[PDB]
């Protein structure tokens, strides 16, 4: 049976919620428990009414994200294919009830300061079901860090972390993220100088430049275990492929070209397409506190430029990681 909101959000945890993100299908809050921040994603399910202008998803439609979130979180504890580059999953609950007034307070604060595209979630009845996903707090998204990074040396570490995590997930799970825009890449400070991963039993390190990258959001993702494929079939989607104004929206169309509109198949080239979009953001949208003012920094820039112009000739993140000169 479903649980009340108070089971996931006891009073102290609920009182410390602040809203951090939103989309058509739900709301993300940060809170604290045992002195540690966490992120809480809340999605209404199974009801007949519109929320933010769209129908609610069913439990069966949220299950792929839950499964993929768990599999990717578990990669931090694996041996042959190990990465911490995907967000940790702490818990998942099915909750029943009206929206907590304390979360409405947080929602209002966000609407007042940042502005929301969503309806104020005050209209849910006491029989409403929700999925509540509790994740590790992964830091701040790359888009919000557009003006906050030190230099292009940091951009290099970010790209290497992303490529390695995707390669590990390709090897372990035949994973494709499929929606790796810069709102779905998080950055957090670390005191570790090197980050560790293992790919098909071979362990390596990546210089951190003081940041640990976490990939989030598996709504469009695909993976498999023992021939059972978990994915989102967007072959008939009437809006996903008609965006404009950002290279992001071309990526959906380019994935559809690569896979012939057959989303169950494994096409790890989609990971390369996203990494190209991310590299493009680093070179064109990100603005750094210290620019490339020395010969050595102009060299790093030239290496990332060379990555941008060559990486689309690689077949997967694994091929990029193992063969591209940027990572030697």
């Amino acid at each position: 049976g479903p649980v009340p909101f108070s089971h996931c959000l006891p009073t102290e945890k609920l009182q410390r919620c602040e809203k951090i993100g939103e989309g058509v299908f739900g709301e993300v809050f940060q809170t604290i428990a045992d002195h540690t921040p966490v992120a809480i994603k809340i999605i209404a399910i199974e009801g007949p009414d519109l929320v933010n202008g769209s129908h609610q998803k069913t439990f069966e439609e949220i299950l792929p994200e839950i499964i993929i979130s768990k599999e990717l979180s578990l990669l931090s504890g694996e041996v042959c294919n190990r990465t911490e580059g995907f967000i940790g999953l702490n818990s998942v609950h099915c909750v029943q009830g009206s929206y907590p007034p304390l979360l409405l307070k947080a929602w209002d604060h966000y609407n007042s300061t940042k502005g929301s595209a969503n309806d104020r979630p005050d209209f849910f009845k006491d029989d409403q079901l929700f999925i509540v996903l509790e994740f590790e707090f992964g830091g701040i998204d790359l888009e919000q860090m557009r003006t906050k990074l030190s230099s292009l040396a940091t951009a290099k570490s970010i790209l290497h972390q992303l490529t390695a995590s995707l390669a590990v997930a390709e090897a372990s799970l035949r994973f494709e993220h499929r929606d790796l825009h810069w709102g779905n890449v998080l950055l957090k400070k670390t005191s570790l100088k090197k980050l560790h991963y293992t790919l098909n039993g071979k362990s390596s390190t990546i210089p951190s430049c003081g940041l640990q990258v976490s990939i989030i959001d598996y709504t469009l993702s695909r993976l498999e275990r023992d021939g059972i494929v978990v994915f989102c079939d967007v072959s008939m989607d009437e809006d996903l492929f008609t965006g404009d104004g950002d290279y992001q929206f071309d990526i959906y169309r380019l994935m559809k070209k690569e896979n012939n509109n057959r989303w169950g198949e494994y096409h790890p080239y989609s990971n390369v397409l996203w990494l190209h979009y991310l590299t493009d953001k680093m070179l064109k949208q990100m603005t750094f506190k210290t620019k490339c003012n020395t010969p050595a920094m102009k060299q790093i820039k030239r290496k990332i430029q060379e990555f941008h112009r060559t990486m689309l000739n690689f077949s997967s993140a694994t091929d990029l990681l193992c063969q591209h000169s940027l990572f030697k």
Binding site: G23, V24, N52, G53, S54, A117, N118, D179, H181, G183, T219, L220, D239, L240, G243, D246, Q248, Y252
Partner: peptide, 6 residues
């Protein structure tokens, strides 16, 4: 940007 929007 989010992949889809109101």
């Amino acid at each position: 940007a989010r992949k889809k929007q109101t």
